[PDB]
Subunit: 42 residues, 4 copies
């Protein structure tokens, strides 16, 4: 949990509530793979 | 240009710069179709 | 409508019906912008 | 690995090679979360 200084952070306005939940999902999806991507080679 | 009170607006933090540009594109893409979607039936 | 030889075409299997409709939308969204992107400068 | 009869499968044509790799990524991303989604509650 050290250094939240990973990639520069940004913000984006998303109109619509249903659309928001959709983007949030794809966002967490990529973040999920990125978590297993930094997984040292077994 | 009257009433910016369309769908409720929201905000989302997106880590990574390359990823940001990507999401912005899909966002403008949907907004683009939405613009021609509200096009009265010729 | 000449030369369908634009970018090489590909195919992707998408599990789930609700998910399919979602991807199709983003696909048409980009294709929509691409149509106005090749719009000569007024 | 029993019953590949999960959600009905579909197919989508994606023009452009760079765009294809992009969609494939989001596809695997959702499939990745779906894998941990069916994870029994610890």
């Amino acid at each position: 949990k050290k250094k939240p200084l990973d990639g520069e952070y940004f913000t984006l306005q998303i109109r619509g509530r249903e659309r928001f939940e959709m983007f949030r999902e794809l966002n967490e999806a990529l973040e999920l793979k990125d978590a297993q991507a930094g997984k040292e080679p077994g």
